[PDB]
Paper text:
More specifically, the imidazole ring of the substrate is hydrolytically opened with the assistance of an essential zinc ion, and the resulting pyrimidine intermediate undergoes an Amadori rearrangement of the carbohydrate side chain followed by ring closure.
Equilibrium sedimentation yielded a molecular weight of 212 ± 30 kDa. Boundary sedimentation resulted in a sedimentation velocity of 9.6 S. Mass spectrometry revealed the presence of 0.9 moles of zinc per mole of polypeptide. However, no appreciable density representing the essential zinc ions was present, and the two canonical cysteine residues Cys78 and Cys150 that form part of the putative zinc-binding site (for a sequence alignment) were oxidized to the disulfide level; it is most probable that the zinc had been lost owing to the chelating activity of the citrate that was used as a precipitant, and loss of the metal cation had been followed by oxidation of the zinc-chelating cysteine residues. A similar observation had previously been made for crystals of GTP cyclohydrolase I from E. coli that had been exposed to EDTA. In comparison, the Listeria protein appears to be even more sensitive to chelator-induced zinc-ion loss, but a search for other (nonchelating) crystallization conditions has been unsuccessful to date. The residues lining the active-site cavity of the L. monocytogenes protein have high temperature factors, possibly owing to the absence of a divalent cation. The enzyme from L. monocytogenes is similar in terms of sequence and three-dimensional structure to orthologs from eubacteria (E. coli and Yersinia pestis). The structure is also similar to mammalian cyclohydrolase I (rat and mouse), although the mammalian protomers are somewhat longer. Semilogarithmic dose–response curves showed symmetrical, S-shaped features, and the overall Z factor of the screen was 0.87. Three heterocyclic compounds inhibited the L. monocytogenes enzyme with IC50 values in the low double-digit micromolar range while not acting as strong inhibitors of human GTP cyclohydrolase I (for details of the high-throughput assay, see the supporting information).
Author numbering:
A (entry chain A), B (entry chain F), C (entry chain C), D (entry chain B), E (entry chain G), F (entry chain D), ...: 3 to 188
The structure:
C-alpha cells in the first residue's frame, strides 16, 4: 500500500516550486493523479516477477520458441520519465518446459513496473527465464524510445535504444542468434 | 531561478513513499536530476513566448506559408507526463510580414515548456501569431501521443490526439482549410 | 459476481458435444479459464459506462478535439467471437467542457466489454458523450475486423467494417465531418 | 455429426450466467449460431488431415519449394478464442515428389480446425509432410496473434508468436534454413 | 449437378489441340480437375444470391455502414480467366434494418461465382441490397485486376479496373459519396 | 498452327455443361477468344526456348550479373489457370558469353508459354542457361501467386510460391547465393 | 514497311560523328538494331488507333468505369528518347456501350507508338473514346517520367509530368472529376 | 566571372576568426572550394531566369498540365545555408501554347541559384510563367527542408516549409486548385 | 567538338524513313536537339574519367566507407536507349587515402557518358578506384532499369539489372561483402 | 569568444563578390547572422567532447547495447556546408560500465560542432568511447546526406555516405558486426 497522500503533498510542493499555481482548475487534482499513476507504474516494487513461472507449464515441445513485439513501458530511474517499446523473447526449451505466453508477458510487465534501466530489464527477464524455465538458452532483445531523451535539452526524437541478453546455447551459437534476428525483422 | 533543492527533497519523499531505496546507486542523484529536468521543461513559466516575433521581416508576399512537422513535446498538466508529436502552422501573411522559421519553432517550444493541455498550446500559438504577425489568418494543427495514456491502466499505445485552431481567413474559408489539410498529409 | 462454476460446466458440455476429450490434459482447465475470461470481457454488463464522465474539466476552449486510433475489442453478440480495431472520437466542446483522454478510452472499453454489435458501440459512445459532455457535437467512427468473418464460413480475412455516428453540429456541417475524415487518414 | 442442440442449450446457460438477456433480439439465435460455428471451426476433429496428400505428383525436381503467407486461423485450446496469422512451408522434394499447393493449404486448415496450440499445428504439419511427401526435409514456420492475449486482462495487442519445426535436411543444414528465412522476409 | 465427364472430355480435346500430350503424368487428371474447378467457381449459376438477405436485426440505427476490402474473385466471361480484388459496400440503413456482415460477403461471392463482367457484379450486388435491405441508399465499389489482361498479348500487369454503383441517397448526395471514398482510402 | 475451331467447340461444350447460355451476348465470341488466347499462352509448345541464346556477346567480364523482377505468367498444368509473378536470374559469366537482357526475358517467356509447374519453369530456365551460356553458374528464383489457389475452395489469396534452381558455382558457394538473395530484396 | 537500311546508314554516321568506333564489336550491329527498334516503337505511324473500338459490347450499364495504371511508353518528339508511366481512363458509358479493357489498352499503345507529346497522347485517347464509344463523358490522366529530363539537360530524375483531358460530363461535373481522382489515389 | 580569389581570402579570414587552423590539411583548399561552390550556386545572379520560353501549338491543349517533384535547392539569404526539396508547377495553357517541360525546370533552377527566400522563388516562378506563357493560370507549390533550421540552436530536423503561388484561373477556381493538390499527393 | 550538323542531317533522314513528317512543327528542331543531346550524353568519349579524381587525406583512416544511391544514367550501346539507376561504391581506405564524394560521382558520370554496357561501367569504376585511391579493396554495385527492355517488343517494365565488381580485400572477404550489402538495403 | 565582426566583414565581402547587393533588405543583417551561426555550429572547437562521459555502473552488465538513429549534423570542412543524418552506436560493456544515453548523444553533438569529415566524426566518437567507457568493443556507423553534393554542379540528391569504425571485439568478431547491422536495419 503506497502512501498516496504523502506523494500528493510532495507533488504540490513541486508545482509551487516550479512557479505554477497549484490551485488553478487544471492542477487541483494533479497531485493525486500523479500519486495514482506512480502506484500503478511502480507496482512491481512490491512483486516478485519470477512467480508467474510458478505455474504448470505448457505441453512438451522441443524447438525454438519466439515471442516477439511484446509491448512494454517503464520509467527511467535517472529522470522518472517513461520509456517504451517492444521486447522479443526467444528460447530453446529443455525437456519440454514451455512458458505460457501470458506468463511471459507478465514477467516483462512486472520487471518493468519500477524505476529501471533498459539494460537491467533485459538481463533480468533473461535471468528469470534461465532460473525458472531452465531452457537450453534464452535470447532477449528490447527496443525502446526514451523520453529521458526526446523532451530534454539533448532533444533527439526518434532515437531507439536496443539491448540484448543471451544465455546458454544462444551465447555460443551464432547461427541460432542469427535465425532469431531474421524472424524478428518481418 | 527555481528552488531545485526543494524539488529534490520532494522527489526523495516520493521515492521513499513508492517503496524504493533512495540511497541506491541508481537513484542517489535522481532527485536533483528531476529538479534540473523540471527547470528545463518548465522554463516557459518564466518566459513571454511572444518575444520571438519582436523581429519580423518586411518582404512583400501575400500567399500561403505552411510549416509542417515541427516536433514538440510538453508535459500534461493532469499527470506531469510527456506528450509529444508535431505541430503544423499555416498562415496568410500580409504586408509581407513573414515569420522566421526558427522564431516559429521557438514560440511552439516556449509555449510548450510548461504544464499544458494540447488544446491550450494550439490556441496560444495561434493567438500569438495573430497578435505579432497580424496575418490575414492562421491555422494551427497539433498531433501528439500522450504517455498520460500509454503507460497507465487505460493502456492505449498508438492513440493520437489532434487539435486545431483557426483564426482570421481560415475561420471563414473552408477551401483554404482544406488545402492546408491536403498539404499536411504528404 | 458471475457464477463461474455454472459457466465452466456448460463449457465442459460444449467440449464433449464437439467431439473433444474434456479430460485430456490441455483441456482440463479450459472450462474455468473460459469462465474467468468471460467474467473479464463481459464485465461491462455490470457497469454503467457513463460514470467515467462524472468528472469533467472546465477550460475556455471551443475548437475541435479528435482522439484517433483508440484500440478496442469486443465480442460479436452473434457468435461470441472477438472483433477488434480502432475508434476515433471527435467532438466540439461547449462552454469549455473537455473530456479527459483516459475517460474517453474507458467509455469505449466499458461499452465494448459486453456482447455487441459494432454499430451499437458506435452510437452508444456517441450518446454517452452527448449526454455527459454536452458538446456542440460529436462524431464517432469505428473500424474493425470481425473474426465472426475471418475464421468462419464466409472466410474473408482482411475485411474491415466501418461504422459512424454523428450528433449535434457534425450532423449538419459536412465541412466539419470532412475535416475530421481528413485528419483520421494520415 | 455434432449435437448442436446440446451446445445451444449450454450457450444459453452461459449467456444467462454472465448477466445477459438471452431473449433480446440480438441473442435469440446466438446459441444455434455458436453451435454451427463450432461445428465448422472444429470440423478437423472428425478428419484425418493426412488424406490430402494421398495424391502426389512425380516429376524429377529436387530443389527448394517454399509456399509462404498461407493464412490460417484456429482456436486456442486454453480459452477457445481465435488465433490467426500465416504459415510458411518449405520442403526439398525427393525423387520429384511434389505437393499440390492447394493440398498443402488444406493440411494446414484441417490440422487447424480443432482446439489447438500453435506449436502442435506447426509440428503436425511438418510430420504429415515428412510422412506423406517423403521429402529430403521440411521447414514449417508459423506466425500468429493470439486473442487469448489481446482481449484479456494481460492486454498485449500486437504480440506475435512464432513457432517452427524442421525435419530432415533442414535440421542439419543451417545455410538452407537461412535461405528460407531470407525468402520469407520480403 | 453438372456433367463433369463431358467437361473433362472437352478439356482433353483442348489439350490435344494445343499440342500437348494429354497422357503425360502432369496432365492425366487435369481434365477432371478442371471440371471440378468449374463446378466450384461457377456454382452461382445454380443459386439465387438474394436468398442470403435479410439477416436484418432492428437497432434504431440510421447511419452509414461500410464494409470494405471484401476479397472476391470471378472469371471474365470474355476469356474465362480469373479476375480478383476487393469489393467495398456501403449503405444507409432505413428504420434500423441492419445487414449481417457475413450475409453481405456471401452475396458478393454468389454473384461472383459465374462468368461475369465486373460491372455486372457491381450493379447486381447494389440491386440485391436495395431489394432485400430497403435501405436509404447503397454504394458499391469494386477494384480488380484482370488476367484477361496480364497474361495475354496486350500484357499490362498492374492494371486495375474500378467499377461503382450508387442507389438511393448515394445517387444524389455527393457529400455522402465523398465520405465513403475517404473511408475506403486508408 | 493450332486448331482453333476445335478448341472453340470444346469451350462451347464446357459453357453449356456448366449451365451457362452460350448464345448470350457476353459469351457468343468467348469460344474463339479462348481459342486465340490459348494459341498465344501456349505458343511455347511449338518453340525451342533455347534458340534465343543462339546469340551471345564477347566482352570479357567475369562478375555477377543479376536480372531481377522479370514479370512472367503461365498456366498451371493441373487446373489451366494462370499463375504470375517475377523471375530473378543471376549468373557468373565465363568468356564474354553475356546474355542479352531481352534474350533472357524471351527464354523465360517461352518456357512459360505452355502448361507448367513453377518448379519446372525454374529448372528449365536454369538448364538452358547452363547449356547455352556455359557460365560458371546460374541461380534462378521465381516468385508467384497461383489462382489454382486464390479462386478455389481452398481460397488463400496472398499466398506466394517461391522456387529456386542453382547450378555450377551457386550450388557450392553459399556466400554467393546469399549475396544474390540480399540483392533481390531491395 | 520502313527503310531500315537507310536508318542504319544514318545511325552509323551518328556514331562516327560522336567520336565512337562503329566497327568495334559492341557497335557493329547497333545500326540495324536501332532501325528494328524504330520500326517497332514507331509502328503507330502506320496504324489508325481508332480501329480497336470497331467492336463494342452492349449491356445496359450507365455508371462509372475506371481503368487505372495502364502502363505505356512512347518517345518524346523533341529528343526521340523514351518517356513512360501510366494512363488512367475513366468514362460514363451511354446506352450500355462499354469498351473491352484490352481494346482500351491497345488504343493507348497505338497512339503512343510514334513520336509524341504526352499532352497529345492524352487528348487523342480522350477524342477517340468520345468518337467511338459515344459515352456521356471521358476523363484521361497520364503520369510519366521523361528521359528528355533525367539523362540530359535538366538532370532532374524523379520528375513526373501529369496531363489530363476531360470531355462531356467530366468537363462540367467537378464532383465526378473529384471522385475519379480519389479512386486513382490508392 | 566571379572574383574567386577575393572570396577565398575572406573565407580564410573566417576560418582564422572561428578558431580553426587554416593551414591544416583538411582546410588548405577550403577557401577556393567555397569560392567555386559560390560561383556555381549563385550563378543565377548573372542570368535572366527566362529569358527563354518558346512554345508550340497543340490542338485542344486547353487542359491542365502539371509537372511535379522537380528537385531544387537554394541558399537561404538569411544564413547562406542550403534549403532543398521539390517544386510542383501546374498551368492551364491558353491557345495551345505548351511549355517545354525542361524549360520549366530550368526556370526553377535559375531562379533558385541565388540567395533566396522560398516564398520569392515560388512567386517569381509563377510570375515568369504568366509573363512568358500567358496561360489561363498557373499554380506553383514548393516544399523544402531548411538547414537554417536543422543544424542551428532551434534544432528541428524534419520540418518542411510549403509555399504556394496562384495566378489567373487558379486564383478564383478552388476546384482546380483542389485537383492539383490531389494529383500532387500520389 | 562534335559535328552537330552532320548528326542533325542523319536524324532528319531517320524521321523521313520512319514515315514521319520532318517539317511539322513538333519536329522542326528535333534533329538539332538530338544532336545537342548526343553531344551531352556522349561527352565522356572525349574525357579521361580518372583525371579529376583527387583524393582527400585523413591520416591513418582505414575503415569502411560506402557511398550509396548515386544516381547515374547512360545509353545502351546495343540500342542507344537510356538505362538509369544507382551506383553504390564501397571501399577500404589504405593509409588514410579517402575519395571526395563529388569526385566519386564525377567518375561514375564520366564513365557513364558514352555508349555502354552496365557491366563495363561497373568494372571500370572499380578499376579507376583501385588505381587512384590504392585502397585495400573496392566493391561497386550498380542497379538499373533498361529502356532497351521496357519500350520494346519484349516489354518488361520493372526489370532491374544488377552488376557488381569486387577488388582487393572484397574479393576474398565474404563477411565484408555481406556487410556492404546489408548497409545498401536500408 | 570569436570575433564576430571580423566574420561579418568577410561575409559582406563574399556577398559583393558573388554579385549580390549587400545593402538590400534581405541581406543587411546576413553578415552578423552568419557570424552568430558560425559561433554556434563551430562551438565544438572550444570544447573537449570526452568530458561528458559520466558512465553509469550497472552491476556486471556485459551484453550488447545499441543506440540507433541518433540525429546529427555538421559542416563539411571542404565547403562549409551542412551534412546531416544519423549515427548508430553499439558497444559491449565491460564490468558493467554503461553510458548514459544522453551523454552519448552529447558526444556525437560536440564532436560534430566543428568543420568535419564524416569519417573523422565516426572514428573520434569510437575512440572517445573506448577511452572513457573501456568496453570490450565499440562499433559506430554514420549515415548522412551531404549538401557539398546536392546543391553543387555535381548535383546528386539522395546520395548517402556511410562510414564506420570498429574497435575491440567488433574488429575481430564478424558475427557481432553482422548482428549490429541487422538490428540497425529493422
Amino acid at each position: 500500500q503506497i502512501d498516496k497522500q504523502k506523494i500528493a503533498d510532495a507533488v504540490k510542493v513541486i508545482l509551487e516550486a516550479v512557479g505554477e499555481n497549484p490551485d488553478r482548475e487544471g492542477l487541483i487534482d494533479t497531485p493525486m493523479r500523479v500519486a495514482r499513476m506512480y502506484e500503478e507504474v511502480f507496482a512491481g516494487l512490491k512483486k516478485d516477477p519470477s512467480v508467474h513461472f510458478d505455474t504448470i507449464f505448457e505441453e512438451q515441445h522441443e524447438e525454438l520458441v519466439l515471442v516477439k513485439d511484446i509491448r512494454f513501458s517503464s520509467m527511467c530511474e535517472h529522470h522518472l520519465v517513461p520509456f517504451f517499446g517492444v521486447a522479443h523473447v526467444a528460447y530453446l526449451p529443455q525437456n519440454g518446459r514451455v512458458a505460457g505466453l501470458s506468463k511471459l508477458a507478465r514477467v516483462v510487465d512486472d520487471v518493468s513496473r519500477r524505476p529501471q534501466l533498459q539494460e537491467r530489464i533485459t538481463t533480468t527477464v533473461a535471468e528469470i527465464m534461465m532460473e525458472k524455465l531452465k531452457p537450453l538458452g534464452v535470447m532477449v532483445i528490447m527496443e525502446a524510445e526514451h523520453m529521458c531523451m526526446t523532451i530534454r535539452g539533448v532533444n533527439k526524437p526518434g532515437t531507439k535504444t536496443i539491448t540484448s541478453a543471451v544465455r546458454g546455447a544462444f551465447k555460443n551459437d551464432d547461427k541460432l542468434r542469427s535465425e532469431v534476428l531474421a524472424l524478428i525483422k518481418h
